[PDB]
Symmetry: C2
Subunit: 268 residues, 2 copies
């Protein structure tokens, strides 16, 4: 399994499955009508939790019935595997989703489907983003659960392919960017439109070397300074502050942002 | 205008405006029910072109009436401007949209609304992506109309902020990545289910220097290398082929892919192939 595909999983499968009368019936009977849009802390998440095994089998039967197009994630994954001619014996699919019952339901059904197709996979869960505070925690969690896994796959000598299709705006862009900094080989994307997988300009990137030297220096003075130590060591803290890398936390001091610490994990 | 925001414009505004019964009426009278989802070469694009002034004023009055939240683009842009405290005198908004009448309609209304709010802006158009062939041409045009414009704004000494809200999937991942390579300072995004904009980790990035040296070497040898010659230069052509940087041309030749040459224009200058 030298060929890893990485993909987020959303709730599109749950929404699509309401097209089957048997699923719609069960979802309405359980009181789960808008199950594909439940927020992280909606009490109706607990109806999914309580019925998890029976909802898994129900959605796996639906997906078996309808095929890969029931999941935009499966659809992009399996199309890309076909287009790249990756063999099942060489494949590992790293799925991730938010730690919410509706998302985990989708992820486990996709994992079970791939395993019956003879493709090994895992499902990792990341904190939900429900607010601006939790956005930053969510990003850090993506570094720990996903980006560091990419880095480790690359150090084992695996090829890593990122499915940009699935996910909400900012998480997919962050996944792609940080994924490429971690050494991912290629990013792809399926348009439903023309039913074909394209390869994004996936240039291999690094943190700008001027900036990486300054940032590694910070991680030798704790994780703050005073302004006469930054101009001291040729660090344009104004430019660091505009580019969102330091926060004036001190009172003429500067401070190194937690996501930046996580990211230095790629290099140190 | 030393604070430049870059944002795509989509047809969400057109769809949203049908909430207002005066707009819905007028659009339905012209036979423009699905005007937010027309394909680039749908004959109804001509009905938009032919009624453009009328539809512009109608959407602009709807926008005035219902507020910025009728456009995910305006909403993210103006929320971001507020959160960053960017002043009207310092602002310039570079909008871009596909060269289709429904999109140009959305873009002109947003441009007009920003200008009435005292924000100078311009609207560039880029080729439609309607297929796999057109995907690559589409990306090249985004390099030429948007990414090279970011490079120019940076060379003028301006700061550049990218609105990563608006767009289908792949365009905004491309704009984020290539815009950061071109020196963009910050990327932001507005979540619907909150009132506020978040700032993405917008790390300053460059092409990996090992790869940039390898890719520049192709340019010195006519953009093709034998496997043997690639070896003598320390260029791992099979790795480059896995990352889609080169394409195998015959039994024993590797050619730099076209897209890579657009990206190298970031470091060598847009015209570098012509010298």
């Amino acid at each position: 399994m030298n060929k890893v595909h990485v993909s987020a999983v959303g709730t599109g499968l749950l929404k699509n499955s309401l097209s089957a009368d048997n699923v719609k019936k069960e979802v309405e009977d359980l009181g789960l009508k808008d199950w594909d849009r439940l927020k992280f802390d909606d009490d109706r998440q607990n109806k999914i939790r309580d019925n998890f095994t029976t909802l898994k089998d129900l959605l796996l039967n639906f997906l078996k019935s309808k095929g890969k197009e029931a999941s935009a994630e499966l659809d992009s994954l399996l199309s890309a595997i076909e287009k790249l001619q990756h063999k099942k014996e060489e494949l590992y699919v790293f799925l991730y989703t938010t730690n919410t019952w509706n998302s985990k339901l989708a992820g486990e059904v996709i994992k079970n489907y791939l395993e019956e197709e003879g493709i090994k996979s895992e499902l990792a869960t990341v904190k939900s983003i429900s607010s601006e505070e939790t956005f930053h925690e969510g990003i850090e969690d993506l570094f720990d659960k996903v980006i560091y896994k990419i880095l480790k796959f690359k150090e084992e000598g695996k090829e890593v392919y990122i499915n940009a299709t699935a996910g909400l705006g900012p998480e997919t862009t962050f996944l792609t960017l940080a994924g490429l900094l971690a050494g991912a080989d290629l990013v792809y994307y399926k348009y439903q439109e023309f039913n074909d997988v394209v390869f994004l300009p996936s240039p291999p990137i690094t943190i700008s070397p001027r900036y990486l030297e300054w940032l590694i220096e910070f991680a030798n003075y704790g994780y703050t300074l005073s302004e006469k130590k930054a101009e001291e060591l040729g660090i344009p803290v104004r430019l660091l502050e505009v580019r969102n890398l330091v926060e004036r936390k001190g009172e003429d001091a500067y401070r190194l942002k937690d996501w930046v610490r996580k990211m230095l994990g790629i290099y140190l």
